[PDB]
Amino acid sequence: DGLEGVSYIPYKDIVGVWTVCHGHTGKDIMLGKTYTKAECKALLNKDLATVARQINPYIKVDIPETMRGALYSFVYNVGAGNFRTSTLLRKINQGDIKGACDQLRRWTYAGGKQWKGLMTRREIEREICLWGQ
């Protein structure tokens, strides 16, 4: 029972890049292969671990494990080099969770990319914002 909006067979995106599962790209993709749900989750695990490797040095405080997972999903979608990522991490490091929530809530109705992964953008907002309350 495949998830809505997940392609289990690799396809070329608009800019010509092979993609599969939760927006996975990379030289590891097997063209023509029908991926299982478990394999798609393994690719997501691999991609989020890569995000974590990039941003962990910039997370300087202990945070709830749910907030951590939310941050990895955020960065996976928005990009580690985006100023939005830098400002979000800085606010969390400072304990300005309300400020982090405010930042995220500007984008609630943007509605751009398909958010990739098993979390939704609203779930990320909820995770950070519910700690600000």
Side-chain angles (χ1 to χ4, degrees), residues 2-3 5-26 28-132:
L3 310 183
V6 180
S7 297
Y8 296 88
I9 304 168
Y11 63 93
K12 280 184 174 180
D13 76 5
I14 203 57
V15 307
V17 180
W18 283 107
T19 308
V20 73
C21 292
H22 295 102
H24 182 73
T25 62
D28 56 342
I29 297 176
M30 300 168 189
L31 301 188
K33 170 180 163 79
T34 302
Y35 286 73
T36 66
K37 290 173 75 179
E39 292 178 320
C40 283
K41 288 182 173 65
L43 287 176
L44 175 64
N45 187 266
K46 179 181 205 293
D47 290 337
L48 294 179
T50 297
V51 173
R53 168 87 172 184
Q54 303 183 65
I55 74 170
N56 276 349
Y58 298 94
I59 299 172
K60 305 179 172 158
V61 291
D62 281 352
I63 57 173
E65 67 273 7
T66 48
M67 178 181 290
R68 189 174 288 278
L71 290 178
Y72 296 153
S73 175
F74 180 87
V75 177
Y76 178 57
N77 280 277
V78 172
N82 195 297
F83 85 98
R84 287 181 265 164
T85 291
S86 304
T87 61
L88 187 61
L89 296 178
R90 282 196 299 258
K91 295 171 197 295
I92 290 167
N93 285 148
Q94 283 173 308
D96 187 7
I97 315 303
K98 289 168 175 285
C101 173
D102 291 341
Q103 176 185 147
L104 296 168
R105 288 193 63 172
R106 302 292 192 192
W107 293 82
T108 310
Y109 309 110
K113 81 192 294 157
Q114 173 203 310
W115 203 256
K116 298 293 178 183
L118 296 168
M119 278 181 55
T120 63
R121 201 189 168 281
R122 178 65 56 93
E123 291 168 1
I124 295 171
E125 278 194 359
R126 184 168 179 93
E127 184 51 38
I128 279 77
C129 290
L130 273 52
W131 286 111

Coordinates of all heavy atoms in Angstrom, one line a residue, residues 7 24 27 31 43 46 54 77 80 88-89 93 101 109 115 120, unseen atoms left out:
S7 N 6.7 8.3 -5.5 CA 7.0 7.5 -6.6 C 7.9 6.4 -6.2 O 9.0 6.6 -5.7 CB 7.6 8.3 -7.7 OG 6.7 9.3 -8.2
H24 N 14.4 11.5 -3.0 CA 15.8 11.0 -3.0 C 16.5 11.2 -4.4 O 15.9 10.8 -5.4 CB 15.9 9.6 -2.6 CG 17.3 9.1 -2.6 ND1 18.2 9.5 -1.6 CD2 18.1 8.3 -3.4 CE1 19.4 8.9 -1.8 NE2 19.3 8.2 -2.9
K27 N 23.6 8.9 -6.9 CA 24.2 7.9 -7.8 C 23.8 6.5 -7.4 O 24.1 5.6 -8.1 CB 25.7 8.1 -7.9
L31 N 18.0 2.5 -11.8 CA 17.0 2.9 -12.7 C 16.1 1.7 -13.1 O 16.5 0.6 -13.3 CB 17.6 3.4 -14.0 CG 18.5 4.7 -13.8 CD1 18.9 5.2 -15.2 CD2 17.8 5.7 -13.0
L43 N 16.2 5.0 2.3 CA 16.8 6.2 1.5 C 16.5 7.5 2.3 O 17.4 8.3 2.4 CB 16.2 6.3 0.1 CG 16.7 5.2 -0.8 CD1 16.0 5.4 -2.2 CD2 18.2 5.3 -1.0
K46 N 18.9 7.6 5.2 CA 20.2 8.0 4.7 C 20.3 9.5 4.4 O 21.3 10.1 4.8 CB 20.5 7.2 3.3 CG 21.8 7.5 2.7 CD 21.9 6.7 1.4 CE 23.3 6.5 1.0 NZ 24.0 7.7 0.6
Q54 N 25.5 17.5 8.7 CA 25.8 18.9 8.3 C 25.4 19.9 9.4 O 26.2 20.8 9.7 CB 24.9 19.3 7.1 CG 25.1 18.4 5.8 CD 24.3 18.9 4.7 OE1 24.6 20.0 4.1 NE2 23.4 18.1 4.2
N77 N 14.2 19.8 3.5 CA 13.3 20.4 2.5 C 13.8 21.8 2.1 O 13.7 22.2 0.9 CB 11.9 20.4 3.0 CG 11.2 19.1 2.8 OD1 10.7 18.9 1.7 ND2 11.3 18.3 3.8
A80 N 20.4 23.4 3.9 CA 21.2 23.8 5.0 C 21.9 25.2 4.8 O 22.2 25.8 5.7 CB 22.3 22.7 5.2
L88 N 16.8 29.9 12.0 CA 16.1 29.0 12.9 C 17.0 28.4 13.9 O 16.6 28.4 15.1 CB 15.4 27.9 12.0 CG 14.5 27.0 12.7 CD1 13.3 27.8 13.3 CD2 14.0 25.9 11.7
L89 N 18.1 27.9 13.5 CA 19.1 27.3 14.5 C 19.5 28.2 15.5 O 19.6 27.9 16.7 CB 20.2 26.6 13.7 CG 19.8 25.5 12.8 CD1 21.0 24.9 12.0 CD2 19.1 24.4 13.6
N93 N 19.2 27.8 19.5 CA 20.3 27.9 20.4 C 20.2 28.9 21.5 O 20.7 28.7 22.6 CB 21.6 28.2 19.6 CG 22.1 27.0 18.8 OD1 22.6 27.1 17.7 ND2 21.8 25.8 19.3
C101 N 9.2 29.7 16.3 CA 7.8 29.4 15.9 C 7.3 30.6 15.0 O 6.7 30.3 13.9 CB 6.9 29.3 17.1 SG 5.1 29.2 16.8
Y109 N 1.3 29.2 4.8 CA 0.5 29.2 3.6 C 1.2 29.5 2.3 O 0.6 29.7 1.2 CB -0.7 30.2 3.7 CG -1.4 30.0 5.0 CD1 -1.3 30.9 6.0 CD2 -2.1 28.8 5.2 CE1 -2.0 30.7 7.2 CE2 -2.8 28.6 6.4 CZ -2.7 29.5 7.4 OH -3.3 29.3 8.6
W115 N 6.3 18.8 0.2 CA 7.2 18.5 1.3 C 7.6 17.1 1.2 O 6.8 16.2 1.1 CB 6.5 18.8 2.7 CG 7.4 19.1 3.8 CD1 7.7 18.2 4.8 CD2 8.1 20.3 4.1 NE1 8.6 18.8 5.7 CE2 8.8 20.1 5.3 CE3 8.2 21.5 3.4 CZ2 9.7 21.1 5.8 CZ3 9.0 22.5 4.0 CH2 9.7 22.3 5.1
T120 N 5.0 16.1 7.8 CA 4.4 17.3 7.0 C 5.0 18.5 7.6 O 5.6 18.6 8.6 CB 2.9 17.3 7.2 OG1 2.5 17.6 8.5 CG2 2.2 16.0 6.7

